[PDB]
Design a protein around this nucleic acid. Structure first.
Ligand SMILES: Nc1ncnc2c1ncn2[C@@H]1O[C@H](COP(=O)(O)OP(=O)(O)O)[C@@H](O)[C@H]1O
Ligand code: BEF
Ligand SMILES: [Mg+2]
Length: 509
RNA sequence: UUUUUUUUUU
């Protein structure tokens, strides 16, 4: 299908809510709702995308805009307008399906729809229901029946669950599907699900298999996403609306980025603790930060350390996929409103989540995918605010920083070295209450995660894997100690005849 | 000795 590039333009006429109203693109009722939010104007992505999404042309839309620049309302606004435009047709049916890669992001988008409802009660008739995992299925279906929503927000697993059973009842008149964080939803592990979703919606559609228009939004996408999306894009033409230059880096330029390089992976823990200590002192505890970590087990561990160091100074919140969904939702609600605190999380929190006035994003180790560097640091410097980011890595992780330059054109100007004092090591290690078996579980989780990104980040396996494994000895304060394991375990992992494996593990069976 | 998420509260 034909990709029509509309690149970033410098001197184009400003689009406003009033101008869209006067032109007849927006109804008074949606104009009202957004106006009462009292935004200075519409963000570039909003100015660029609202009219084309609503256009009577037979096209799909792809939109790139940097983190925190209003992509959500960029699709919610025209969606509401479409509901108003067709308000007498199929009024009890879902007309827009919005898909997101995490439950908390889907629930956030639902909360944004609710903000529109609250700014004009006249829009409550265009109801919305979220379909996400970890919530009561029956209770959600009762809500579908009671409210008969025109907008569904969902995560892929639960949506498929619902579609396999109820696609005929609610989903035969869908006109739009939106993939928020589209590049993530088209990666392995989501792509098959999005193709299943798209296939069901297209099959069940009462007009035709090509009726549904598809909108793709992300801070990170290019021409290659069209290929990946080929099986789910129905229309003969695709409009690519870009608010970023082709050779311009996708990272938000307002973010003051730095990297702190240690000799050992474990030393990044001490570096982060000292950094947070300094920030709490210098900002007089007026400090709101997010710290990312590679695995669930390590995130949980890092949270324990940070509570011991800092719970007296600030709240420490633990956020990952093994936290119950009720608790995930309450901590998201709290961190959105809190002035200060530290959110400790996995990449569950890397994309989309809008926590106002985060001062700093910290990272211990590398993200789960290259693009997530940009999304992680984009949790700060949102909606015109300032922000900083610090990447804490060890020397053997440096090829990641080179790949950011080579692949994504991101050059981190501020780079410095770190070496922990014996004092900070003793302070941090003494409060660790984990048993050796727990430390083994934690470090093994790191070995497995780092192993899966060796090719992507161009790591040297022979250096990175022993370095990660050596974290076990460092945390037990005995550098020559190796991780005790069984031969069957080493066989499973695939390192039983390797010198790399012998440097990491001791076969204490 | 589940590597980030993602139905299985249908
Ligand atoms: N026109 C606007 N002017 C100022 N702030 C806005 C505008 N539209 C949305 N916002 C705010 O910007 C923040 C980030 O929006 P979001 O849609 O999450 O960004 P993105 O999805 O592009 O990362 C939200 O708090 C939202 O209320
Ligand atoms: F690009 Be955003 F932080 F959803
Ligand atoms: Mg977003």
């Amino acid at each position: 299908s034909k990709l029509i590039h509309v690149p970033k333009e410098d001197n184009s006429k400003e689009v406003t809510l009033d101008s869209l109203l006067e032109e007849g693109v927006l109804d008074k009722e949606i104009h009202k709702a957004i106006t009462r939010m009292e935004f200075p104007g519409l963000t570039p992505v909003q100015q660029k995308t609202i009219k084309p999404i609503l256009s009577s042309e037979d096209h799909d839309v792809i939109a790139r805009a940097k983190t925190g620049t209003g992509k959500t309302f960029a699709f919610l606004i025209p969606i509401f307008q479409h509901l108003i435009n067709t308000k007498f047709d199929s009024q009890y049916m879902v007309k827009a399906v919005i898909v997101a890669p995490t439950r908390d992001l889907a629930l956030q988008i639902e909360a944004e729809v609710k903000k529109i409802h609250d700014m004009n009660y006249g829009l409550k008739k265009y109801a919305c229901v979220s379909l996400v995992g970890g919530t009561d299925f029956r209770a959600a279906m009762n809500k579908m029946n009671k409210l008969r929503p025109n907008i569904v927000i969902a995560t892929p697993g639960r949506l498929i669950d619902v579609l396999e059973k109820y696609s005929n009842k609610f989903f035969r008149f869908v006109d739009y599907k939106v993939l928020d964080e589209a590049d993530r939803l088209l990666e392995i592990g989501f792509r098959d699900d999005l193709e299943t979703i798209s296939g069901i919606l297209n099959e069940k559609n009462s007009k035709s298999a090509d009726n549904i228009k598809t909108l793709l939004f992300s801070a990170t996408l290019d021409d290659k996403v069209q290929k990946l999306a080929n099986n789910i894009m129905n229309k003969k033409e695709c409009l690519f609306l870009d608010t970023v230059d082709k050779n311009e880096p996708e990272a938000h330029e307002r973010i003051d980025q730095s990297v702190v390089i240690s000799e050992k992976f474990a030393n990044s823990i001490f570096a982060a603790v000292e950094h947070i200590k300094k920030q709490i002192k210098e900002r007089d505890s007026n400090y709101k930060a997010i710290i990312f970590a590679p695995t669930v087990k390590f995130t949980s561990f890092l949270c324990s350390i940070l509570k011991n160091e800092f719970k007296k100074d600030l709240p420490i919140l633990e956020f990952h996929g093994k936290i119950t969904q009720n608790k995930r939702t309450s901590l998201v609600k709290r961190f959105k409103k809190d002035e200060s605190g530290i959110l400790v999380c996995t990449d569950v929190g890397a994309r989309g989540m809008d926590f106002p006035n985060v001062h700093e994003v910290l990272q211990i180790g590398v993200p789960s995918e290259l693009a997530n560097y940009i999304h992680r640091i984009g949790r700060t410097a949102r909606s015109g605010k300032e922000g900083s980011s610090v990447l804490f890595i060890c020397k053997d992780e440096l090829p990641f920083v080179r790949e950011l330059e080579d692949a994504k054109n991101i050059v981190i100007a501020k780079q410095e070295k770190y070496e922990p004092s014996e004092e900070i090591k003793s302070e941090v290690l003494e409060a660790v209450t984990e048993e050796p078996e727990d430390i083994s579980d934690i470090v093994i989780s790191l070995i497995s995660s780092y192993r899966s990104c060796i090719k992507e980040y161009r790591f040297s396996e022979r250096r990175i894997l022993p370095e990660i494994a050596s974290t076990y000895g460092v945390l037990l304060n005995d550098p020559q100690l190796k991780i005790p394991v069984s031969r069957r375990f080493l066989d499973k992992l695939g390192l039983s005849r390797s010198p790399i494996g012998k440097a990491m593990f001791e076969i204490r069976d």
